[PDB]
Each structure stands twice: as C-alpha cells, then as structure tokens.
Amino acid sequence: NLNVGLIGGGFMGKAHSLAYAAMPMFFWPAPALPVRKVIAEANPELAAEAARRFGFENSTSDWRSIIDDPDIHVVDIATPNHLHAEIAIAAAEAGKHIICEKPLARTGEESKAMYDAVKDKNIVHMVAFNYRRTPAVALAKKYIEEGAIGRILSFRGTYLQDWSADPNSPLSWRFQKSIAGSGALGDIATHVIDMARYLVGEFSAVNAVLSTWIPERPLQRGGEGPKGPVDVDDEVMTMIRFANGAVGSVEATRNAHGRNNYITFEIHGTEGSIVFNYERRDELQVAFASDQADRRGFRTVYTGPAHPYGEGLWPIPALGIGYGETKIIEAHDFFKAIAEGGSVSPSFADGYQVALIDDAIVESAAKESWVDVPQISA
Template identity: 45%
Template sequence: MSQPLRVGMVGYAFMGAAHSQAWRTVNHVYDLPVPVRMQVVAGRSAAAVAAAADRLGWAGHTDDWRTLLTRGDVDLIDICAPGDAHAEIAIAALAAGKHVLCEKPLANSVAEAREMVAAASAAHDSGVRAMCGFNYRRVPAVALMRRMVTEGRLGTIRHVRASYLQDWLVDPSYPLVWRLRREVAGSGALGDLGAHIIDLTQFVTDLSISAVCALTETFVKSRPLPSSPPGTGEVTVDDAVLFLARLGDGVVASYEATRFATGRKNGLRVEINGSLGALVFDFERMNELSFHSTEAPADEQGFTRVLVTEPTHPYMSAWWPPGHLIGYEHTFTHQAYDLVQAIAAGSDPAPSFADALQVQLVLDAVSRSAETSSWITVERSSAEPSG
C-alpha cells in the first residue's frame, strides 16, 4: 500500500465537522491513489478539542496548531479556523513543507491573500500543493453546468444572475459571534456568502468579474455579547450586499448575498443566459439542473429538469444507483477526492490560491464600491479562474 496522506486539521466547528465527514468518507467511496489518515485535529481549548477528536474520528488532538508544523506524521494541514487565522497558518504550513487546504474566503484582505499566493508559489517547486475550499464547485449539477457551458450549449453568454440567501441573523437578539466582527471575519454576507457565488459564476463561465457597482447594509447595528459580562457590542460587518457586475467584456451580471432573507435557509441560485439557451442551478434542489435550449422544436421549448444522478455525471459514478440523491456533505468528499488525486499526481489542484485571490480582489472591489457609490474596476491576479 502507498504511503498514506496524513491530515492535520485546524478547527472543529461547523466547517471542521464537514471536512471531517469528508476525510472519514473519501477512502470508502473512491479508489484513491493513496489512502487518507485523519491524524490530528487542533483547537484552542484542550478539553473541547479532545472531545471533538473523539466525536469526529481524529486519531489525536492538540491545543496548539503550531505543533502540526514539526510533526513528521502530518503531510497536509486543513484550515477550518476563522478568517483572521488563515494567512498565518497557511504561510507557516507551506514553509514547513505541508500541503494546505484552506477554507474560503482565502483571507481577510487582498494583502494577506497575496502573501498566501506567494507562499504557495514558493513551495510549489518542492512538490507542495495548496487549494482553497470552495465546496460548491463540487456539486455534480454545478460541474455539469460548467461542462455544458464549456461545450457551447448556451452559445454566447449574455446574462448571469446569482444570489445566496440565508435568514439566521433576522432575530436581533442573536449574539455577536465572530462572523459579525470585521477584525475576525473580514466582512459579513459579502465574504461569507458572496465569495461562493463570485467563485461559482467565474468557475461556470470561465470568465472573470471585471467591474462592480455595489451597495451594502447593516440592519442590526449592535447585538448581545456571547459571553460574560452581559452587554452589547457593535456589528462591524455588512448584513446584506447587492452588486452589478461585468464578467469579461460583454456579459452583465447581478449578485445578492444576505443573511436577512426571512424564510431562506441556504438559498444559493445561479442562472446563466446565452444566445442558445439557459441553465439554472438552485442548491435547495441540488441534484437537479434546469436547461432550456432554443434549438429544441418550438412546440417543445421550455426548461427541462435534468436529474444529475447518472454514473456519467460528474462525481456520481462512486455513489448510488441513478435517481438516488446525494447531499451537502458529499461536496466536501468530492473536494477531498480531487485534492488527494492532485497531490498524488503532482498536479495543481483547483481552485488554487491564485484563483482564490481573484475572488478576494472582487470582494475588495465590491467593498470599495459600496463605500464610494461608484463603479470600481476589479484588479486582475496573475491566474485565470481554473476548473
């Protein structure tokens, strides 16, 4: 048997649990070139991380992520910590010769993201690989959507519409968690949700957002502190963001991300309109893709429901018989599979840190546009969005 890929993970909350599920599952679903071993999980509280290791299936645990850098039994560091820790951990891990998987958004600022890209580039020649975790790329229906656009099924792309709607902050008594503090999270709905739809539309169309015009709003300005002593604190991030954009030179687009869409739990939707047809993906029906073709006979035209569960669909050959659905957690298993395959082959996983920097540049432009109420040109990173 080949030498296993031994994983150390930093963070064990929501994303840590999702990533743990993927690392537990990927060996049993896919025929990997190397097996995966869940070696150690790191967190700040010794008692909490010990409990998490037992619950999530990690062989060991530590309350200091820096110990992962010197451990000879850790090959890859999976970063599921809050955004303000991404840059420090990733740069140190890459310098130590560890592969890195980092959750989105890549960093809290363009400057940090650039440093991370530079660190990944410096480690690349030594065979060290880095990837950013935009898991929605790994929804089979999204991967099929990209394939159909690439094959020219929509003709010339003209319109893109994307929204990501949640409602978990509607209650003003919800506490001031880290996601509501700019110094930890970087931004609010913009980075938390907007980053996903920015990446998805660039991924599916293979076009980069070139200019934006945005507005943001914070509806609840202060919230209860989550710990003693009692009191309130200021919300320093956006609750909602809307922006217009241009993709490439001729495609127009609109984006909306909010955590105040009452009744919406995880409503991610992307629509692509072209000269020959349209594609619509709605995560609340994640096993389906809607396709309209102008090339169908006139009396048969309309949106067709494609159930994306056939073995010929992306990622689906490893799962169940046709018509048997998969869920949210499978996107992380697909992500782990793609990363292990790339590391074993010595190839470059996608999205790279450079791809994630391009998303960061859009986030930055949107933020500056909202502050100035003007159109902002998006700076280009050195890499095109990759598949």
C-alpha cells in the same frame, strides 16, 4: 496514506472529518488514503473531545505542533478567518499541502501573503469553495464548455440566508470585522463569486451596495444582556461586467426569512439558459433554444451516473446529494492532485482573486462607483 492535521473542529468540523472518513468508499480506487492524524483546537480538553468525536488519532491545543510535525502531509485550516493567513504561511514554509476554508483571509492584502507563500512551492493548495463541486454545477460547466447554451450574455447569482435574521442572534466572530474581515460578502457571497468565475469567467468591474440591517447584537435572555456593534455588512448586491463582455449581478444576505441556504444562479446564453438552486441541489434546470417549438422549456435534470463525478456517487439520480458529497468530491480532487503531483481549482490563486473582487466591491460601495477588478497577476 496521507496524514491530515485539521485545525479547528467547530461548525465545519463535522463536514471535513466526514470527507476524510468517506472519500475512499466513494471514489475507488482512491489515489491516496486520508488519515485523520491530529486535530488542533483552542484548548486541550476541546481538542481531545473533537478528536474522539471526529475520529482523529491525536489532539493538540497548539496548531504549530502540527506544522512542525514532519509526518503531517496535509494541513486543513478550519479556523475563523483571522488565523487563515498565519497558519497557511507556516504550513507552506514547512512544505505541507493545504486546504483552507473560505474566505481565504480577511482582506486582499492578507490573502496576497497566502498566495505569495504557496505560489513558488511544490504543494497542492486549495480554497474550500465546495459548492462548485455540486454535481449539478459541474454539469452546468459541462453544458457551457460544450457550447450547448451558446455564448453567455448574462449571469444572476444569489446566496440568501436567514440564520441571523433575528437581531437577538448573538455577536459571534462572523459579525466582527476584526476577525471575519467582512460579513455576508466574505462568508457567503464569495461562494457565488467563485461560481461566477467558474461558469462565466473573470470579473472586469463591479458596482455595489453594502447594507447593515441589524447594527447591534447581544454579546455571546431575549437579547436583554449587554450588546456589541456589528461592523460588517449583512447584505451585498453588486453589478458585474465580465472580462468576456457578459454582464451580471450577485446578491447575498443574512436577512431573507424563508431562505435557508439559497445559493442560486441563472445564466442566459445565446442558445439556452441554465438555472440552479442549491436548496434543490440534485436538480439542474436547462432550456435549449434548439428544442422543437412545441416542446421547448427548462428541463429538470437530476444528477446521477451520467453526469460529472457520477462514477463516484450514487447509482441512481435523486438517491440524494447532501452537503457531505460536495466535501467528498472536493477531497477526492485534492488528494488526486497530491497523488499525481498536480494542482486543483480553486487554488489559493482563485482564493486571492476572490479576495480582490471583495476588496473592489467594498471600495465600489464606499465610492458609489464602478471599480476595476485587479487580476492576481498585477
């Protein structure tokens, strides 16, 4: 039994709480049993209502009381980006295992403080880049590590969304630099960057453009009310030189009508190619050069028992993977590392590396030039 203190029970609250409720039913025997012990929220009534909805034993309106609670094994940080650092540093000092939502923090420097706080402790630390644990993405990693597409030449990744494509969508914390740190870059590009690091390798250099299409939004009517500035990017595109000599690019936007949760990649290798589209996340597309010339092309592979993580999921391909299975796989690996005194990827080290890439992107965009990405060891 590992006791979880969840901090924040907003748009993501449902997903985390599901992972903890469900993970043992999927991956059994379970290394440990997550217990939804206590949830913190911004005020006591909120916290109590969240605790009822998500099935937590206890509620608090002061997250510090979770840190000081010696019966709490795991702190799950699901607040806006401005509290990630302070909470994680307090939990690390109290010897807690930590899972933290992305982006790790607002900036590279702030993410550095979080990494520095966990680097030397005997705790499992994880950043919530859940999409790399889509079974189709794990499958792409398997094909690549096997050599089945040869050496990687080129990588394309997108994260295209449209939930704020209407300028009357309100000025939430995601549009305020002081809370979020960045816009599309921090909130969604980081997921793609993580996939790139996972599947291709480390970034050597970036060259980017940041765009804001909608500079003002209604404060939280038809947006006739008072308005505030958007001082973050709506959109980012960046070219990439990988340390291993592959090239690529990443594009993310909040302003692509028709695109809902369109995290995709295309990878070209010397002996084949892989395509993935999270809107059809059950599928991975793979083209092998070795196929006979008259029957050569992308195969649509549906993930199931035969594919990574399949032993813990559904008994046939296409029974259907949702967002929740990715969080379950995430929790499985997290609790497994804890139970075995091991560690998981992506960790705060990966979180910090992504934050350094983001800083380099921002700097590249500002100077209109190639910027070298520092590795976390510098």
